[PDB]
Each structure stands twice: as structure tokens, then as C-alpha cells.
Ligand binder design. Sequence first.
Ligand code: HEM
Ligand code: HEM
Lengths: 191, 191
Amino acid sequence: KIPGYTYGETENRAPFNLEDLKLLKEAVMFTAEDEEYIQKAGEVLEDQVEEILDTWYGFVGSHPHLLYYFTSPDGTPNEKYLAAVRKRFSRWILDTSNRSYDQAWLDYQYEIGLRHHRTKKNQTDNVESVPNIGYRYLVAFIYPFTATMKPFLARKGHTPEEVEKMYQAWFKATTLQVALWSYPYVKYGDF
Amino acid sequence: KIPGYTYGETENRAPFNLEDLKLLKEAVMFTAEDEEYIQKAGEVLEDQVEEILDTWYGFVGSHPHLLYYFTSPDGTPNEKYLAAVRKRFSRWILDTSNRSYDQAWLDYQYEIGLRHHRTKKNQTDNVESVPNIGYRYLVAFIYPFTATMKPFLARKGHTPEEVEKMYQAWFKATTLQVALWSYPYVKYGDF
Ligand code: HEM
Ligand code: HEM
């Protein structure tokens, strides 16, 4: 098992439903054409995942104000936290590419947003760390995550158009997901 | 002479400062190299601006749930609302390419986020319409805005190199800006 990973077992039901989902997917231009390529993207990404996270944490860990979010109260990086989160992140990359975007998925998007927000942050791994990830970086992270991703989508031998649609499906998925994760951060009624 | 366009005149100081902006630019990977390239995006965009809004309002306009936020209580578009908003939106495309991202720029980012949130929505043009634009769509719109932008950066004859640099800079500026806009949506201290 992957510790802390509780997909389909949140227990706890999302405040947004499947109609909300249809409507947000439309805002983000996500169609059945995108579900083909997001999963195609899975195949291309599966065995590259370790190297992706190395480029990811290499970006986080090269900025103090972002590494911050992984630190012990003494301002040193919690190595256990980093490594515990790394694994669920790994699994998310795959989930995005493999789960059906349904009630359970939605329930876990609620979960994940709660884990970034002060509501649930740090309870999953029983670490002591910063209480809240300020929402501004969640939005901002949309850029580096998407953009780091692009080379990795090519590397496994794919024709610019194959890569551009995989990329775009990934861009939309990320945006969509983040948008959903904003729920706990937003003043009630403004979501 | 653009009604309700109050850039530099907001009377109204932003709750995020310029060190916040440096850190957020950093999350978004935005550097001096991007400064140059949005600037260059501007020369390309300037004389296409009208067609971009036609592409843009076409998107808002074929989704009832999105046109929603421009409608009068009876559920029709407030055409006075769209025309007034379209002018300010025009100038924003230009401002993103043209202003230094300084304290002024930042004060107006605050303002704009207030005009989307219930705080100020509908007051600029003195109209009756819906009270709040739910934050979920603000984030979601990052994708359509960015992606609908790419083909326009290509139509003035530039290399897939230059065009890729101008696109990236735009994708970064948009995300960055939206991230800032979320402020009045987000519970206090969670941003
Ligand atoms: C593109 C936006 C982001 C994506 C796609 C993303 C993805 C993820 C995923 C998949 C997890 C683990 C999910 C799980 O628990 O099952 C996670 C947790 C975490 N991420 Fe993010 N993340 C984003 C933004 C950020 C930002 C901006 C930071 C700031 C450094 C950050 C730092 C963390 C931390 C500290 C955790 C552990 C949360 C906890 O204590 O449960 N993430 N993220
Ligand atoms: C990438 C995301 C978005 C961008 C770049 C953007 C851009 C803008 C700009 C530049 C303005 C004029 C600001 C000014 O007065 O100076 C505006 C206003 C407005 N936009 Fe957005 N916007 C975004 C998201 C949305 C969404 C999701 C909707 C929903 C349909 C929307 C609907 C509106 C409305 C109704 C106003 C008028 C607000 C008021 O009453 O003053 N916008 N937007």
C-alpha cells in the first residue's frame, strides 16, 4: 500500500457534484478527445515518473520560499515528509491518467485540496510542518508543473502533434484539478 | 477615456506587495527573458486585438453557465455590460504586454480581482446582473485564455521558436495574474 493514499476511502463526500464537474470540464475545454490523450499520456509517462519528480523537487528545493512548505518548524526540510508525499504524488500522476473522473475521483480531489489547505495539512503523515500552503502558489504551480512536463511527453518517441495533444490534455487536467482544490480555500458561497 | 478603466487611479492599495510579486514570478518561472517576450507578443497582438475578443466572447457565449455572468435578472445578456467590459479587456491585453509589473500594475490586479468577486462586480458599469463569479471558473479560464492565444501569436510570421517564447511568457503572465485575482475569494490568511 501507499501510506496516506485513501482514494475511494475518504468517508467524507465532496461538496461539488458531477454536474458541477461537467460544467467545469466545459470551461476548461475538456472533451472525450481529451480523455483519450490523458491516458495515452499515462503510458508515455509511467516509467519516467521518478525522473519527473526529481525535476520537480529540484525546482521546489531550489527555492527557499517553496521548499518552505516541506520544512520542520526549525526550517530544515522534513525528509520523511518529502519522501512520503513523493509517493502519493507519483500515484496522482497515474491516477490523473487512469481514473474515471467520477464521484470517488471528485471525493479525492476534495481530499487533496483539504491536504494542501490548513484543514488537513500535515495530518496524513503525522509530520509537524507549516500549517497552510498559501493558495497563490497552487495556482502558480499550474505553470511549472505543465511546463516541466513537456519534454517528458516527447522523450518516448512521439510526433509533435501526438505530443501537443497529450500536453494539452495534461494542461487542462492540471487546471481543472487545481480549480477544484481551491474549494476549501474559498470563502463559503464564492466558489 | 475608457469608462471604468482606473489603472493607476484605484485609490485602493493592493494587499500583496512587490516582494510577493518577485516570489510569485519565481513560482511561475517568470524572468527578465519573459519581460522581453511578452513585450514582443504585444507588437504581434496589437492589431489583432479585436478578433481575439471575438474568439473569446464566442467561447463565453456558447455556454449558458458562462454567459450567465453577463446576464440581466431575466436571464438575457446585458449588452451594455458586455460592451463596457470588452473595452477594458482590450486594454488589459495591451497592459500585460506593455506595463512594467510594478506597484501600479499590482494595484490594478487587486482591482480587477475585486470586480470579478462579489465585492465590486457590477458596480463599475452600474448594472443589474449576477452577484459573484465563482472562483472555480477564474482558474479554469487560464486554459482557454492561454490556448486561444497561441494561433494569434503565429499569424504575424514568426519562428516556432519566437512563437513558443511569446506563448510561454503569456501562459506565465496569465497564471500569475489569475493567482493574484484570487485574493478577495480566499479566506483571510490562506492566500
Ligand atoms: C500544480 C499544482 C500542484 C499539484 C498538481 C500538486 C500535487 C500534489 C499531490 C498529488 C499531492 C499528494 C496527494 C495525496 O496526498 O494523495 C500533493 C501534496 C503536497 N504538495 Fe502539492 N501540488 C500542487 C501545488 C503545490 C504547491 C504550490 C506546493 C508548495 C510547495 C505543494 C506542496 C505540497 C505539500 C507540502 C504536500 C503534502 C500535503 C499534506 O500534508 O497532505 N503543492 N501535491
Ligand atoms: C483567464 C481568466 C480571466 C481573465 C484573463 C479575465 C480578464 C478580465 C478583464 C481584463 C476584465 C476587465 C477588468 C477591468 O475592468 O479593468 C474582466 C472583467 C470581467 N470578466 Fe473576466 N477574466 C477571466 C475570468 C473570467 C471568467 C471565468 C468569467 C466568467 C464568465 C469572466 C467574466 C467577466 C465579467 C462578468 C467581468 C466584469 C466584472 C465587473 O462587473 O466589473 N472573467 N475580466
